[PDB]
Amino acid sequence: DFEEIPEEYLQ
Amino acid sequence: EADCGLRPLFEKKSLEDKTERELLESYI
Amino acid sequence: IVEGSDAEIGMSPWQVMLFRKSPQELLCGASLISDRWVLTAAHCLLYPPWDKNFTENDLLVRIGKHSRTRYERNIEKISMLEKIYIHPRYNWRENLDRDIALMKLKKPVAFSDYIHPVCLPDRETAASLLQAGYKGRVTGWGNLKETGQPSVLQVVNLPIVERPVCKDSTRIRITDNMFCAGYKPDEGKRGDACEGDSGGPFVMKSPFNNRWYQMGIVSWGEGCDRDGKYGFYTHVFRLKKWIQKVIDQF
Ligand code: NA
Ligand code: NA
């Protein structure tokens, strides 16, 4: 449902 | 903060949003 | 938000989205109170009846947003949490008394046209403005009806309700740390928070100094926009000594 966010915020 | 609650696109420009007047009118 | 409208750009620059990392989803609203502190409802983070007990690493906060689902490149900012603080007397067992929590960000967020903190009330602003009939404003990305989801942030203005009317609308025990808001059945106009809006702010624009103050936190309700029911909000001023203690100590 949500656009993927930059991977840097999930590290 | 000293600048809290003053919105860049509204109060800081002296522009009102479309419904803030409704709030003001209720403060009787 | 039920029976609201699309927010204007920059209308609520303190609005924060609490975002679950995995699965990626909206958890709650929240508000920016300084460059490193975010205010929300305790029940957004801790609610044992629903097996909810998030840790810092489970969540992100997204600040400066308008679109619900889009990644708003060059506009929104995404912050990790350093530490969650729940009010020590938050009553999740019964009635959500003292439904308040703070989140400290790992790094300060840069303010912009879209990102700016709301004020917290002083005793006098609270005494003046927390009166039945006076309207505040609730914003969020929650559902558009009880039983669907908005493209962009929604806004609704709602009147504070007399305490006896709030009490007589529900079987839940109300406390002085809560207030309720919404239109009465005979008032015609409608509107409420709904699922996904909780934790977000109930704000009022002081007519004395033309600043926005966060008087409430979207806390609980029984349905969304039901006739004869009202939304309940955490009374921020009543809990401000705890907010200050946390910020001063940490
Ligand atoms: Na009652
Ligand atoms: Na209602």
Asked whether the bond before C23 is cis by omega within 30 degrees of 0, the reply is: yes
How far, rounded to the nearest angstrom, does the alpha carbon of residue C130 sit from its chain's CA centroid?
A: 16
Residue at C178: amino acid letter = M
Residues of chain B neighbouring C35 (CB-CB closer than 8 A): 1
Within 13 Å, how many C-alpha atoms sit on residue C169's CB side? 25
Closest chain C residue by Cα to residue A1 = C69
Residues of chain C neighbouring B13 (CB-CB closer than 8 A): none
Residue the block writes with tokens 């504070």: C160
Q: Which residues contact C84 (CB under 8 A, 6 or more apart)?
A: C45, C54, C55, C56, C101, C102, C103
Whether the CB of B7 is below 8 Å from some CB of chain C: the reply is yes
Q: How far apart are CA C178 and CA C169, in angstroms?
A: 14
Residue C133 contacts residue C159 (beta carbons within 8 Å) = yes
How far, rounded to the nearest angstrom, does the alpha carbon of residue B27 sit from its chain's CA centroid?
A: 14
Residue at B24: amino acid letter = L
Residues of chain C neighbouring A4 (CB-CB closer than 8 A): 24, 71
Q: Across-strand partners of A4? A: none
DSSP state string for C158-220? EEB--HHHHHHT-SSPP-TTEEEE---GGG----B--TT-TT-EEEEE-TTT--EEEEEEEEE
Q: How far apart are CA C52 and CA C49, in angstroms?
A: 7
Q: Which of C12, C31, C169, C198 does the annotation list as catalytic?
A: C198
The three-state secondary structure class of C114 is coil
B5–C213 CB contact, under 8 Å: yes
DSSP state string for C1-55? -BS-EEPPTTSSTTEEEEEETTTTEEEEEEEE-SSSEEEE-GGGTEEGGGTEE--
Q: How far apart are CA C249 and CA C124, in angstroms?
A: 25
The pair of three-digit structure tokens given for residue C103, joined into one six-digit string: 């989140």
Enumerate domains of chain B plus CATH numbers: 1-28 (4.10.140.10)
Q: How far is C71 from chain A (nearest CA, A)?
A: 6
Q: Which residues contact B25 (CB under 8 A, 6 or more apart)?
A: none
Q: Which residues contact C169 (CB under 8 A, 6 or more apart)?
A: C180, C228, C229, C230
B5–C118 CB contact, under 8 Å: yes
CB nearest A2 (choices: C24, C78, C80): C24
* Pairing of the two strands C201-205 and C212-220: antiparallel
Q: Which of C12, C31, C43, C219 does the annotation list as catalytic?
A: C43
Resolution (angstroms) stands at: 1.3
C71–A5 CB contact, under 8 Å: yes
Active site residue C198: yes
Length of chain C: 250
Q: How far apart are CA C92 and CA C84, in angstroms?
A: 16
Do C and A touch, 3+ Cβ pairs within 8 Å? The answer is yes
Method: X-ray
Q: How far apart are CA C123 and CA C237, in angstroms?
A: 7
Q: How far apart are CA B27 and CA C89, in angstroms?
A: 33
Q: How far apart are CA C68 and CA C236, in angstroms?
A: 26
Distance from the CA of C219 to the center of ligand 2, in angstroms? 15
Whether the CB of B13 is below 8 Å from some CB of chain C: the reply is no
